[PDB]
Design a protein around this ligand. Structure first.
Ligand SMILES: CC(C)=CCC/C(C)=C/CC/C(C)=C/COP(=O)(O)OP(=O)(O)O
Ligand SMILES: [Mg+2]
Ligand SMILES: [Mg+2]
Length: 493
């Protein structure tokens, strides 16, 4: 067959082979400078785990020399190994997101907690946040506590502030698989005499999480998101492998009581991104076998829908997001009874397209992610008459943005002038596969050639990561590179 189909075949064999007999595709997160620095600061202050603190120090120095992250994370590591405001401004350089204000408060307080800068002179209510993702409440309370103690006003802390941190004292892996949240909570809790009896045992478990490279990962893993995305890719192949059934089973039995899905095993917080990938996959691979899970996931999404027609990530009443809205539109469009919500979601996407054809960055730090989600919703939901024209024009502007910013090597990076990476290019390919038929030398043709060229001898892909959290800080789940390139090649062939 073609080189693209040969490439797709080798990648599919590799992805199938990586799914375990439990139906899951393992998806560990790499060490990250931020969490490693916080783990270092916590263990150092507590004079615990000398072996672990030495490896963390070595990891941080090695990473800073050989693979330095964004300026904020570098400043954090330098603070702990020892222009903070300059690093904040550079790390949040034109971070254009509805959370920007919260993020500047958070990151500044992190740096101040580590002695790199002064604490923000804000009313304590600045740290108050409406209920959203479970662990976010804990992080904000931990930073409020650190600021109260750091500025010499410990009496400001109320019992309801401490109560928010109690999950950090539970044994075993971090609550909600989030090491950042537990590390921040523990840095705060070590200032409380009445919480100190529980600290010793958790510090031993923290220290036992170090990866072989001596670092601490952001999260314990991302196996639900990764397995669902890979199942979807595999289900779009001409003859899907048998393993889609155990993958569908493994996902369905992990559904949360609200009918949605978290990003990893043991994550009780559901989110629209995970849920939409699971729903799309189950719809194709197990619509009868898992009829009830499908219906519960649709019900989960509908109960999150915001009044403006968009969907938030975690909680109704937090800002709708374009990529989440497009994802939910595509995931809900399989039931003609949901057409009203689907159409309102697609209209939300069209209203929020930018004058240059783009949408926005959120959980992905490239522009191509939201383009691909938007284009799938704009072209996958059937529409006719005036509405067909409106959606086709918006999809055309998005695909034109892709063509206009395509790098000479045929790929795309995180931004118009960045070097190409396979993941960013994979998202663009999914979108462009909704455009005109590929032609020799055309944008889709060239993008597929780039992907063919970048395939490693072992059949896989190595890519700069695109996932951020907390936004805009990147974290690296290497398993996603193979999965999203496979999803692109499955869409494009
Ligand atoms: C699964 C997926 C890729 C979709 C997006 C949401 C999500 C569950 C991401 C997985 C990584 C993670 C646990 C970060 C939490 O972000 P945060 O709470 O630190 O983010 P914020 O501070 O920017 O709100
Ligand atoms: Mg957060
Ligand atoms: Mg977090």
């Amino acid at each position: 067959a073609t080189a693209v189909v040969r490439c797709r075949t080798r990648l599919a064999r590799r992805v199938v082979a990586a799914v375990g007999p439990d139906g899951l595709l393992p998806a560990p997160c790499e060490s990250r400078v931020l969490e490693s620095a916080l783990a270092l600061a916590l263990l150092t202050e507590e004079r615990a785990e000398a072996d672990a603190t030495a490896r963390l120090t070595a990891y941080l120095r090695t990473t800073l020399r050989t693979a330095p992250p964004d300026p904020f994370q570098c400043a954090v590591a330098r603070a702990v190994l020892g222009d903070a405001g300059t690093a904040l401004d550079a790390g949040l350089d034109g971070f254009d997101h509805f959370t920007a204000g919260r993020k500047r408060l958070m990151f500044r307080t992190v740096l101040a907690a580590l002695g790199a800068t002064g604490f923000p002179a804000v009313p304590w209510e600045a740290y108050d946040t409406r209920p959203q993702q479970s662990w976010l409440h804990m992080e904000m309370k931990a930073l409020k506590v650190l600021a109260a103690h750091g500025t010499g006003h410990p009496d400001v802390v109320r019992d309801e502030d401490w109560r928010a941190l109690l999950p950090a004292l539970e044994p075993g892996p971090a609550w909600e698989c989030n090491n950042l949240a537990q590390l921040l909570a523990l840095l705060a809790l070590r200032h409380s005499p009445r919480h100190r009896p529980a600290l010793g045992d958790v510090l031993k478990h923290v220290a036992g999480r170090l990866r072989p490279d001596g670092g601490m990962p952001f999260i314990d893993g991302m196996t639900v998101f990764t397995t669902a995305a890979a199942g979807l890719a595999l289900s779009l192949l001409p003859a899907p492998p048998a393993c889609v059934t155990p993958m569908a089973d493994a996902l369905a039995l992990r559904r949360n009581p609200d009918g949605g899905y978290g990003f990893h095993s043991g994550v009780a917080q559901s989110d629209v991104a995970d849920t939409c990938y699971v729903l799309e996959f189950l719809r194709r691979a197990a619509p009868d076998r898992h009829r009830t899970a499908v219906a519960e996931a649709e019900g989960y999404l509908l109960a999150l829908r915001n009044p403006d027609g968009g969907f938030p990530t975690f909680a109704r009443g937090t800002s709708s997001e374009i990529a989440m809205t497009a994802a939910a539109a595509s995931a809900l469009a399989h039931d003609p009874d949901r057409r009203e919500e689907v159409d309102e979601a697609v209209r939300y996407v069209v209203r929020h397209q930018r004058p240059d054809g783009t949408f926005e960055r959120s959980w992905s730090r490239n522009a191509t992610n939201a383009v691909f989600r938007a284009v799938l919703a704009l072209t996958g939901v059937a529409a006719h008459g005036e509405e067909r024209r409106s959606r086709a024009r918006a999809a055309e502007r998005a695909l034109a943005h892709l063509a206009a910013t395509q790098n000479g090597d045929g790929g795309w990076g995180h931004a118009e002038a960045e070097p190409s990476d396979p993941i960013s290019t994979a998202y663009a390919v999914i979108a462009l596969a909704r455009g005109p038929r590929a032609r020799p030398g055309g944008p889709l043709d060239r993008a597929l050639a780039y992907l063919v060229e970048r395939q490693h001898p072992d059949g896989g892909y190595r890519s700069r990561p695109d996932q951020a959290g907390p936004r805009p800080l990147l974290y690296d789940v290497p398993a996603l590179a193979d999965v999203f390139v496979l999803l692109a090649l499955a869409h494009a062939t």
